[PDB]
Design a protein around this ligand. Structure first.
Ligand SMILES: CCCCCCCC/C=C\CCCCCCCC(=O)O[C@H](COC(=O)CCCCCCCCCCCCCCC)COP(=O)([O-])OCC[N+](C)(C)C
Ligand SMILES: CC(C)CCC[C@@H](C)[C@H]1CC[C@H]2[C@@H]3CC=C4C[C@@H](OC(=O)CCC(=O)O)CC[C@]4(C)[C@H]3CC[C@]12C
Ligand SMILES: CC(C)CCC[C@@H](C)[C@H]1CC[C@H]2[C@@H]3CC=C4C[C@@H](OC(=O)CCC(=O)O)CC[C@]4(C)[C@H]3CC[C@]12C
Ligand SMILES: CC(C)CCC[C@@H](C)[C@H]1CC[C@H]2[C@@H]3CC=C4C[C@@H](OC(=O)CCC(=O)O)CC[C@]4(C)[C@H]3CC[C@]12C
Length: 548
């Protein structure tokens, strides 16, 4: 009883020794080591001793970080410090309690060196123990929440609106009298157009709930047979106003405002947005696909015996190193290109780009490679001329995590030196570390052995951060709304762990098989709760964001 019966048909599909992890690891370490020597001769070029910086890493006290950098660096390092701790608990459960279950699988017991043995693919469908995987996936959601209730637990104008689309010939009298007659419950303190004003204004009220009500009445989605939104109500003042044509917003400070960009609104602005974002999403397909093609040479006609796999130098190391190169350049595209979308507020742009870096990195590292590698008609050709799971059984992901761990972090030292010719980007750095955490979490239950490398991705990213925050990057104060943003991404990670579990369950047993059902039930219950935080606002004691 086996899956491949390698004695009958010596089929190329049965993968490398150890998934090619040993060669990837050996070359990645050796490339890391070489980069640390290269770093040393770089930082010594400009003016205590060769490796002195490596001693500094473990000497600097947390209070020195706190004192020099300010609170944003400590809130950042707290986030890391929690995720490191999170991954020890998830790590010990994965390697301790998931892996010995997987490895008890009867399905890949031939092919003893196959990395596939340490994955869900080793478990025969209908085997009772498959509930343990669904259970841990849920348990990990509770831990990624509880660990973020702890992170957030440790950490620390409101009547003024900015009103846009006023005609340049408008008058403060009419603008003032409008609110106090269209909404007689209000009272107006100030009402001023702003920098021949170009049709933007500040207005200030007496009361905050009234402010929110007035702010809603220009923007709110509620409907009739006539119109899909609450159209802003008429007045005697209206000729100065052009009320229907406004956009109205809580006023940020003028240091946040792009007085250039907000000159365009409605369908035109959504055109510039969609044709920038489509070009980038098209481009991801071509950046992605070389990695998947170079990896997938399990074709036939000739070159069919197991002996015909290439060296894991080309079939594992090279493609994951190329995918890393594109992963590490991707932030530099979206930070550059987001300038041309013309957001209204620098704060928005910063807060947008962190979620855009993250979701493009997710499409091009996790989701499109997951669909690409899952698109193995390969099994259909073997079968016609369950044991379906990724080619190499997902060793590709381990190999990515290793590549990003050793080569990525060693490169992170070198990201700030220079002189080879003869300021902390908090959003980018958040996006990048949650991209990697997402992969680890996604595979942590289908493919346990990824988690140790996930942990050491974090430890080395942490040390290199604690180092380069204190010594290298300029001390920076930041907009708090990105730290709170990043915690939502951490909650996405175990949810995508549940989704791919439902996928690789439902492509290996029916949707009516009870583990498929249970995973669906958990997922649908989880998502309605998570959505009810976003605007509906019912749950605000739960899931995250305990604050001082
Ligand atoms: C979304 C919430 C809207 C809230 C808001 O005010 O809009 C912006 C959300 O920021 C965005 O630009 C959203 C980006 C959407 C990208 C996906 C499309 C491409 C898909 C590819 C397939 C807020 O940012 P802002 O610049 O501060 O406000 C501008 C608001 N206007 C311009 C929309 C009025
Ligand atoms: C296969 C392809 C062609 C379609 C797959 C869908 C994605 C391209 C979509 C689905 C959800 C979208 C995201 C949903 C929400 C946001 C948040 C948005 O930023 C916000 O914070 C909005 C609210 C605010 O700024 O206050 C920026 C765009 C982004 C990342 C979107 C980018 C495009 C995404 C990933
Ligand atoms: C193959 C299956 C999984 C379908 C593909 C689904 C994706 C399009 C989803 C999965 C997870 C989603 C992300 C999970 C979490 C967030 C956080 C969310 O954050 C906020 O809106 C923060 C707002 C604030 O903090 O003020 C922005 C969208 C984003 C990136 C989502 C974008 C759409 C993603 C990539
Ligand atoms: C039929 C329906 C139920 C299918 C749902 C498919 C997608 C639309 C789902 C799958 C995963 C979801 C995400 C999973 C996790 C999160 C984190 C969490 O993010 C926030 O709270 C950000 C917004 C805020 O700051 O208030 C809640 C929304 C979000 C992005 C979800 C948005 C909707 C997503 C993309």
């Amino acid at each position: 009883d086996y899956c491949y019966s390698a004695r009958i048909r010596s089929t190329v599909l049965q993968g490398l020794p150890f998934g090619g992890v040993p060669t990837v690891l050996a070359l990645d370490f050796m490339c890391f080591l070489a980069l640390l020597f290269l770093f040393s001769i770089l930082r010594k070029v400009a003016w205590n001793g060769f490796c002195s910086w490596l001693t500094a890493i473990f000497r600097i006290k947390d209070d020195e970080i706190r004192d020099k950098c300010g609170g944003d660096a400590v809130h950042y390092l707290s986030f890391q410090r929690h995720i490191i701790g999170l991954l020890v608990v998830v790590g010990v459960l994965s390697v301790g309690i998931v892996l010995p279950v997987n490895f008890s699988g009867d399905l890949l017991e031939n092919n003893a060196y196959s990395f596939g043995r340490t994955t869900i693919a080793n478990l025969k469908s209908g085997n009772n123990l498959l509930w343990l995987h669904t259970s841990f996936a849920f348990l990990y959601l509770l831990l990624t929440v509880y660990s973020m209730r702890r992170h957030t637990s440790k950490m620390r104008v409101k009547r003024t609106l900015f009103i846009n689309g006023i005609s340049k010939y408008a008058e403060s009298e009419k603008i003032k009298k409008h609110f106090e007659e269209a909404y007689p419950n209000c009272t107006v303190l100030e009402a001023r157009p702003c920098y021949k004003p170009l049709g933007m204004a500040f207005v200030t009220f007496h009361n905050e709930t009234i402010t929110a009500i007035i702010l809603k009445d220009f923007n709110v989605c509620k409907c009739q047979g006539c119109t899909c939104r609450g159209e802003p109500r008429a007045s005697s003042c209206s000729e100065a106003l052009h009320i229907s044509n406004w956009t109205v917003t809580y006023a940020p400070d003028p240091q946040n405002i792009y007085w250039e960009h907000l000159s365009i609104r409605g369908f035109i602005w959504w055109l510039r947005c969609l044709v920038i974002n489509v070009v980038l999403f098209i481009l991801l397909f071509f950046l992605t696909t070389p990695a998947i093609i170079i990896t997938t040479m399990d074709k036939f006609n000739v070159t069919k015996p197991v002996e015909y796999l290439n060296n894991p130098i080309i079939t594992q190391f090279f493609p994951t190193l190329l995918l890393w190169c594109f992963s590490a350049l991707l932030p530099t595209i979206v930070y550059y290109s987001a300038f041309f979308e013309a957001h209204w507020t620098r704060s928005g742009e910063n807060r947008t780009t962190m979620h855009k870096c993250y979701t493009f990195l997710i499409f091009m590292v996790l989701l499109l490679p997951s669909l690409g590698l899952s698109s193995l008609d390969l099994f259909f050709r073997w079968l016609f001329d369950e044991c379906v799971f990724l080619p190499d059984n997902g060793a590709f992901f381990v190999n990515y995590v290793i590549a990003s761990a050793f080569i990525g972090n060693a490169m992170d030292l070198l990201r700030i030196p220079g002189l080879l010719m003869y300021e902390f980007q908090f959003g980018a750095a958040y996006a990048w570390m949650m991209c990697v955490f997402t992969v680890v979490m996604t595979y942590s239950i289908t493919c346990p052995i990824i988690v140790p490398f996930g942990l050491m991705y974090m430890l080395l990213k942490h040390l290199v951060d604690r180092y380069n925050l204190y010594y290298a990057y300029l001390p920076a104060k930041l907009d708090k709304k990105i730290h709170s943003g990043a915690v939502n991404q951490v909650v996405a990670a175990p949810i995508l762990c549940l989704f791919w579990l439902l996928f690789f369950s439902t492509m290996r047993t029916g949707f009516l098989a009870p583990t498929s059902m249970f995973t669906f039930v958990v997922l649908v219950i989880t998502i309605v709760i998570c959505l009810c935080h976003v605007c509906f606002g019912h749950f605000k004691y739960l899931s995250a964001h305990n604050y001082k």
